[model samples]
Target chain A: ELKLRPLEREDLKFVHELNNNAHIMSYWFEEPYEAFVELQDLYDKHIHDQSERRFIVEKDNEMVGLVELVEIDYIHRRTEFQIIIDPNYQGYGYAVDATRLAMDYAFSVLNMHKIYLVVDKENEKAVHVYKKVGFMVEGELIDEFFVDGNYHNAIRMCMFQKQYFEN
Target chain B: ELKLRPLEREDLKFVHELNNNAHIMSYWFEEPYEAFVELQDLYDKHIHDQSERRFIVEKDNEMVGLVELVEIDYIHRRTEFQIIIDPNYQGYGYAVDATRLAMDYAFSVLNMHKIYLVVDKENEKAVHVYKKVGFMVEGELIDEFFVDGNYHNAIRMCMFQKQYFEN
Candidate 1:
């Protein structure tokens, strides 16, 4: 029953829930909390932006997580990929399938040349999933994130159309 | 008499004119026209965005042009530069000082490491201006923009702080 679909305004409820999760937001660089009105305003504002594609991961129509292709560049034909499974839904294989579906849309539909992401080096779980999805480590960045009073290293990972469709 | 200042609500009157100019926006890779409301909404929504810094290029307290340090990356210490003089003010050399001032903000104030920009290869006049200001050519992109019913090539240019101060 797991699936993926484009994010809509109605999905903000689910988005709001995760956005307020202190631990979850810390995995991201933004402040750990936001008012729903601000979120709605931003959504309305960026509705016309073509540089990002955000999706809601679902299980039988129930919100399960979020996945995105951000910083999409048409001239460069590349994008940055991101995903977050609903904390309650983590450990399920939803992360992999959702990622693959987004990649298909990026490479097969959007015709992108490459896709990339950055993950805290200590996020071994995420790194493993990206590797299993064919993303290669491109570089290691120093002191990229500050969390809990300490700076953490991050790894830049990438995959190209050739590697994506090499089969 | 050239100076730099943050873009404000009233500045959209000028931004609208340049943004709607096919010649100016064609130099960019976006739609040549944007409604005032659309621009206003973006400004409102992105008011809190830390990744971008927009400014109004001023001369004798009048709107002369627009300059920006966009796509600012803190961890990476870089930003993409963009500028457009009011067509009426072109060739007056405001291009150089406004750029130097914005570069100072990026390198000196923001403490960014590098600043970069891309322009159509046919933008020779502006390209020459950049060289006179010390930006080095980094790459020539192929078919990066589609305008005038055809694709156009563009050149990626950049400058670093060491280069900015090495003299």
Candidate 2:
């Protein structure tokens, strides 16, 4: 259940829900989406910016996931990735498919040398997903994140274009 | 050049040199290999256990680096890595390649889920090398090592076998 297409203005409400859900968005932003207009404004800019990539992942015409590649560093030939799937879709391979698709686009279409992600060390499930997607860890920031009134570590990971060739 | 073979009794002198280098050995063992017999005693136990593993790196038939994956845990699928390169070979790509070969043995041959290197944070070069080769800082213990009249943080980096597929 993986579908990727351009985002639309009408999708803001669904996007906000996907973004605000505690389980889905826990590792992302420190704040929840407050209004549809704010989400719409962000989408408008995201859709128009080629370098700031975004896509809506759907199953049977219902949005279920969000996939994006951000902080694209053309100068460094690298970019950061962000993905969020509805909590209801957890434990399934849909999120995994979405991640692989996004990764393919990053390394193949973008012709980038490397794509990486930063994750909270405690996010073991997401860590598994990244590993499955072929991203090797690059580094970690010790006690760099504060969540739920407790400090956590942030780990960095990357996949190289050469790795894609090997696969 | 990269060469990997079993640990032998005659190589203890290089082991002594590696252990004597204050910049390299101080991070792991606070003490140095004061005598060849001490090295031999340790080597005998390592060779007998079969669980203990070590290797030497040679460049043009001259020992240039030392690396080992030891204290393997079959139940947890984990191993510990220890490495040191000749001071003259510093800044060369030898250390990285040697690490790559060792990880190949650790993950592909040993079939381990995770491999890690515990290092002092002040050893910035080692930290950089580990990150460049795909280990993530799993955690840190502040003031974990005492060397050169100062207390240094010990950083633990880990990588899972599944991460091998990542770019």
Every candidate's lDDT: 0.82, 0.74
Model 2: per-residue Cα lDDT over A14-126, one tens digit each: 78787676555557634554577877877776776767777788878878788878877664456777888777766677877887888888888888767777788887777
TM-score of each: 0.61, 0.49
Residue B15 displacement in candidate 1 (angstroms): 1.1
- Candidate 2, B131-164: lDDT as tens digits: 9899987766443344566545578888777787
TM-score between model 2 and native: 0.49
Candidate 1: where is the Cα deviation over 4 Å? Answer: A1-68, A73-104, A111-167
lDDT value for model 2:
0.74
After the best TM-score superposition of candidate 1, give how far the Cα of residue B153 lies from its true spot, in angstroms: 3.4
Clashing pairs in 1: none
iRMS of candidate 2, one decimal? Answer: 15.0
Q: Can you give the lDDT of residue B100 in candidate 2?
A: 90
What are the C-alpha RMSDs, in order, of all predicted structures?
A: 6.1, 18.7
